[PDB]
Design a protein around this motif. Structure first.
Motif, PDB file in Angstrom:
ATOM      1  N   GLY A 133       0.858  -1.401  -0.029  1.00 55.80           N
ATOM      2  CA  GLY A 133      -0.140   0.000   0.017  1.00 55.80           C
ATOM      3  C   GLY A 133       0.784   1.144   0.072  1.00 55.80           C
ATOM      4  N   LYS A 134       0.183   2.361   0.382  1.00 58.77           N
ATOM      5  CA  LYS A 134       0.762   3.535   0.091  1.00 58.77           C
ATOM      6  C   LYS A 134       2.144   3.886   0.983  1.00 58.77           C
ATOM      7  N   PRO A 135       2.497   3.172   2.066  1.00 60.72           N
ATOM      8  CA  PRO A 135       3.644   3.521   2.591  1.00 60.72           C
ATOM      9  C   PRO A 135       5.083   2.734   1.495  1.00 60.72           C
ATOM     10  N   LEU A 136       4.610   1.911   0.776  1.00 63.09           N
ATOM     11  CA  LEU A 136       5.532   1.129   0.115  1.00 63.09           C
ATOM     12  C   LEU A 136       5.788   2.149  -1.185  1.00 63.09           C
ATOM     13  N   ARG A 137       4.555   3.106  -1.632  1.00 62.36           N
ATOM     14  CA  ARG A 137       4.752   3.383  -3.023  1.00 62.36           C
ATOM     15  C   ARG A 137       6.129   3.852  -3.481  1.00 62.36           C
ATOM     16  N   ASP A 138       6.538   4.732  -2.825  1.00 64.36           N
ATOM     17  CA  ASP A 138       7.982   5.486  -3.304  1.00 64.36           C
ATOM     18  C   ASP A 138       9.111   4.803  -3.269  1.00 64.36           C
ATOM     19  N   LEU A 139       8.977   3.893  -2.227  1.00 60.36           N
ATOM     20  CA  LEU A 139      10.153   2.790  -2.095  1.00 60.36           C
ATOM     21  C   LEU A 139      10.269   1.965  -3.241  1.00 60.36           C
ATOM     22  N   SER A 140       9.094   1.596  -3.964  1.00 60.07           N
ATOM     23  CA  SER A 140       9.004   0.719  -5.054  1.00 60.07           C
ATOM     24  C   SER A 140       9.303   1.524  -6.228  1.00 60.07           C
ATOM     25  N   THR A 141       8.513   2.700  -6.384  1.00 55.18           N
ATOM     26  CA  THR A 141       8.968   3.899  -7.778  1.00 55.18           C
ATOM     27  C   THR A 141      10.532   3.937  -7.847  1.00 55.18           C
ATOM     28  N   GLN A 142      11.212   4.267  -6.535  1.00 57.45           N
ATOM     29  CA  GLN A 142      12.581   4.257  -6.663  1.00 57.45           C
ATOM     30  C   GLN A 142      13.281   3.033  -6.932  1.00 57.45           C
ATOM     31  N   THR A 143      12.816   1.864  -6.602  1.00 55.15           N
ATOM     32  CA  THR A 143      13.541   0.625  -7.035  1.00 55.15           C
ATOM     33  C   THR A 143      13.349   0.481  -8.718  1.00 55.15           C
ATOM     34  N   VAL A 165       4.691  -2.073  -9.596  1.00 58.53           N
ATOM     35  CA  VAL A 165       3.995  -2.490  -8.459  1.00 58.53           C
ATOM     36  C   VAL A 165       4.447  -1.782  -7.016  1.00 58.53           C
ATOM     37  N   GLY A 166       3.317  -1.507  -6.505  1.00 56.79           N
ATOM     38  CA  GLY A 166       3.208  -1.005  -4.950  1.00 56.79           C
ATOM     39  C   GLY A 166       2.879   0.399  -4.659  1.00 56.79           C
ATOM     40  N   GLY A 167       1.804   0.344  -4.103  1.00 54.92           N
ATOM     41  CA  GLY A 167       1.125   1.483  -3.584  1.00 54.92           C
ATOM     42  C   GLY A 167       0.504   2.305  -4.539  1.00 54.92           C
ATOM     43  N   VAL A 168       0.083   1.556  -5.728  1.00 53.69           N
ATOM     44  CA  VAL A 168      -0.560   2.341  -6.836  1.00 53.69           C
ATOM     45  C   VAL A 168      -2.218   2.620  -6.510  1.00 53.69           C
ATOM     46  N   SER A 169      -2.682   3.716  -6.447  1.00 52.81           N
ATOM     47  CA  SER A 169      -3.926   4.009  -6.066  1.00 52.81           C
ATOM     48  C   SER A 169      -4.643   5.154  -6.974  1.00 52.81           C
ATOM     49  N   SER A 170      -3.925   5.596  -8.072  1.00 51.92           N
ATOM     50  CA  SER A 170      -4.283   6.712  -8.775  1.00 51.92           C
ATOM     51  C   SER A 170      -3.756   6.697 -10.104  1.00 51.92           C
ATOM     52  N   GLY A 171      -3.971   7.505 -11.059  1.00 53.78           N
ATOM     53  CA  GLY A 171      -3.332   7.738 -12.076  1.00 53.78           C
ATOM     54  C   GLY A 171      -2.178   8.354 -11.846  1.00 53.78           C
ATOM     55  N   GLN A 172      -1.723   9.265 -11.272  1.00 57.41           N
ATOM     56  CA  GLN A 172      -0.475   9.904 -10.868  1.00 57.41           C
ATOM     57  C   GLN A 172       0.486   8.675 -10.455  1.00 57.41           C
ATOM     58  N   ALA A 213       0.388   5.773 -11.064  1.00 62.92           N
ATOM     59  CA  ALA A 213       0.609   4.728 -12.112  1.00 62.92           C
ATOM     60  C   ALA A 213       1.938   5.603 -13.169  1.00 62.92           C
ATOM     61  N   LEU A 214       1.740   6.716 -13.189  1.00 64.11           N
ATOM     62  CA  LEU A 214       2.289   7.754 -14.332  1.00 64.11           C
ATOM     63  C   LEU A 214       3.851   7.803 -13.754  1.00 64.11           C
ATOM     64  N   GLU A 215       3.790   7.884 -12.156  1.00 64.61           N
ATOM     65  CA  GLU A 215       5.089   7.950 -11.763  1.00 64.61           C
ATOM     66  C   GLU A 215       6.009   6.621 -12.150  1.00 64.61           C
ATOM     67  N   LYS A 216       5.190   5.645 -11.695  1.00 64.52           N
ATOM     68  CA  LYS A 216       6.115   4.477 -12.227  1.00 64.52           C
ATOM     69  C   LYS A 216       6.428   4.217 -13.536  1.00 64.52           C
ATOM     70  N   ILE A 217       5.444   4.583 -14.225  1.00 61.11           N
ATOM     71  CA  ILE A 217       5.584   4.600 -15.885  1.00 61.11           C
ATOM     72  C   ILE A 217       7.061   5.372 -16.194  1.00 61.11           C
ATOM     73  N   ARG A 218       6.917   6.736 -15.781  1.00 65.73           N
ATOM     74  CA  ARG A 218       7.786   7.544 -16.133  1.00 65.73           C
ATOM     75  C   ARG A 218       9.305   7.083 -15.324  1.00 65.73           C
ATOM     76  N   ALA A 219       9.213   6.318 -14.335  1.00 63.92           N
ATOM     77  CA  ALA A 219      10.330   5.965 -13.549  1.00 63.92           C
ATOM     78  C   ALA A 219      11.065   4.768 -14.474  1.00 63.92           C
ATOM     79  N   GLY A 220      10.126   3.893 -15.442  1.00 63.36           N
ATOM     80  CA  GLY A 220      10.910   2.886 -16.253  1.00 63.36           C
ATOM     81  C   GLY A 220       9.735   1.852 -16.298  1.00 63.36           C
ATOM     82  N   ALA A 221       8.497   1.860 -15.694  1.00 62.41           N
ATOM     83  CA  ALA A 221       7.693   0.848 -15.950  1.00 62.41           C
ATOM     84  C   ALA A 221       6.932   0.654 -17.177  1.00 62.41           C
ATOM     85  N   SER A 222       6.821  -0.163 -17.899  1.00 62.83           N
ATOM     86  CA  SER A 222       6.101  -0.585 -19.051  1.00 62.83           C
ATOM     87  C   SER A 222       4.437  -0.862 -18.731  1.00 62.83           C
TER      88      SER A 222
END
Ligand SMILES: Cc1cc2nc3c(=O)[nH]c(=O)nc-3n(C[C@H](O)[C@H](O)[C@H](O)COP(=O)(O)O)c2cc1C
Ligand SMILES: O=C(/C=C/C=C/c1ccc2c(c1)OCO2)N1CCCCC1
Ligand SMILES: O=C(O)c1cc(=O)[nH]c(=O)[nH]1
Length: 364
Positions: free
Chosen positions: A275-285, A302-309, A311-320
């Motif tokens: 969930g949310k507390p994992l979100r940015d840790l996952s994005t950074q990974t 994957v981790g802590g995604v609950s909005s379009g933002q 999702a897009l943060e992870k996509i911009r960071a490198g997720a397909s």
């Protein structure tokens, strides 16, 4: 309008208000599997389509492993609007997992902690369950709705690599992609399979088994990794994935850390936090793995995604592609919400579609 808001603000806190977490999970699997939910109304725009891993994905938002461990609700999950479904983790033999209670809500943190321990019906059951709809899945896949199958290891298994190999042989022929889940925090020793030497041996065997499958039945192989790895572990993973031609990474599993700031009463339960507390840790990974693989290795974020933002943060960071599970809090409307907000953001930020945004932070 009002569909989301009847779920975010009523039905769910009603049930979460009533139902123990594991009971809620089981009822939701049952409900979903019977198709009792209305079909989602969001119709996927072409800007959401992604082509990766040998497939078309109608939208990049999947359901993460752990919700449908035994392959029971795949169709209802597509009906809820997921672009792709991952089932599992599935272990070779059936096994019960840990004693209850073993899953906990941290509503103040919008987080969950789980220690299921790979409760699994086993390969044989799941094999027959997928065979009974195998042709229906071949059409879904052709229509841009692929299926992943996540493989675990039995608790008492004396040879980890042979557990994963058996999974490849039995479920590979029924999967668009397989995941070697070496990152559950709830099976002793499992995460040490992430080390360089153990990983290279394990994945060599996995790949050899996969390559032995007939061409039409030959899935992509991805490695699902923890958020809690050292820099050395990440380096070592990237190097192995490239040396062996692993098809992709799933980033990340749950965390054994407990970020400062958690408020839920149950924060010190043993298990993986989601969930949310994992979100940015996952994005950074994600960000680190993408740079380490030069952007050449598809990542499912994957981790802590609950909005379009999110999702897009992870996509911009490198997720397909991305997945969500924990966002158990908002119910089915969260799926269409993520998708519509992601489309609005891609348009606002000047992207032609998801594909154009993949890894965009690294080219700034
Ligand atoms: C209750 C629960 C059970 C899970 N079981 C699995 C599993 O069996 N295999 C797996 O690879 N990941 C498992 N996960 C992890 C999710 O797949 C995902 O990696 C993690 O929860 C982060 O995403 P989220 O914050 O959207 O839930 C589980 C997560 C939860 C919350
Ligand atoms: O997996 C769950 C809950 C999942 C709920 C999934 C879900 C919830 C509401 C629904 C639905 C599916 O369809 C219609 O309304 N857990 C409960 C909280 C802790 C983790 C397990
Ligand atoms: O306990 C499980 O089965 C499980 C939990 C989790 O968070 N991650 C995982 O890979 N398995």
């Amino acid at each position: 309008t009002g569909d989301e808001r009847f779920y975010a603000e009523h039905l769910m806190p009603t049930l979460q208000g009533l139902l123990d977490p594991e009971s809620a999970h089981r009822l939701a699997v049952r409900f979903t599997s019977l198709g009792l939910l209305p079909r989602a109304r969001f119709q996927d725009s072409d800007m959401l389509e992604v082509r990766v891993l040998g497939h078309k994905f109608r939208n990049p938002v999947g359901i993460a492993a752990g919700f449908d461990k035994h392959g029971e609700a795949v169709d209802g999950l597509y009906k809820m609007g997921f672009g792709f479904v991952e089932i599992g983790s599935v272990t070779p033999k059936p096994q019960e997992g840990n004693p209850r209670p073993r899953v906990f809500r941290l509503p103040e943190d919008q987080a969950v902690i789980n220690r299921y321990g790979f409760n699994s019906h086993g390969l044989s059951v799941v094999e027959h369950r997928l065979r009974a709809r195998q042709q229906k899945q071949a059409k879904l896949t052709e229509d841009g709705l692929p299926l992943g199958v996540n493989l675990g290891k039995n608790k008492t298994s004396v040879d980890a690599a042979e557990d994963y190999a058996e999974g490849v042989r039995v479920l590979g022929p029924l999967a668009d992609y397989l995941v070697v889940n070496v990152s559950s925090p709830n099976t002793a020793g499992l995460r040490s399979l992430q080390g360089k030497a153990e990983l290279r041996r394990l994945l060599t065997k996995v790949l050899q088994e996969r390559d032995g499958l007939r061409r039409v039945h030959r899935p992509a192989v991805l490695v699902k990794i923890a958020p809690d790895l050292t820099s050395q572990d990440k380096e070592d993973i990237a190097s192995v994935v490239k040396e062996l031609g692993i098809d992709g990474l799933i980033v990340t599993n749950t965390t054994v850390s407990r970020p400062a700031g958690l408020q839920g009463a149950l924060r010190s339960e043993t298990g993986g936090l989601s969930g949310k507390p994992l979100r940015d840790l996952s994005t950074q990974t994600i960000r680190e793995m993408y740079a380490l693989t030069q952007g050449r290795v598809p990542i499912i974020g994957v981790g802590g995604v609950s909005s379009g933002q999110d999702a897009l943060e992870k996509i911009r960071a490198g997720a397909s592609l991305v997945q969500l599970y924990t966002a158990t809090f908002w119910g089915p409307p969260v799926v269409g919400k993520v998708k519509r907000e992601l489309e609005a953001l891609l348009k606002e930020q000047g992207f032609g579609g998801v594909t154009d945004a993949i890894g965009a932070d690294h080219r700034r």
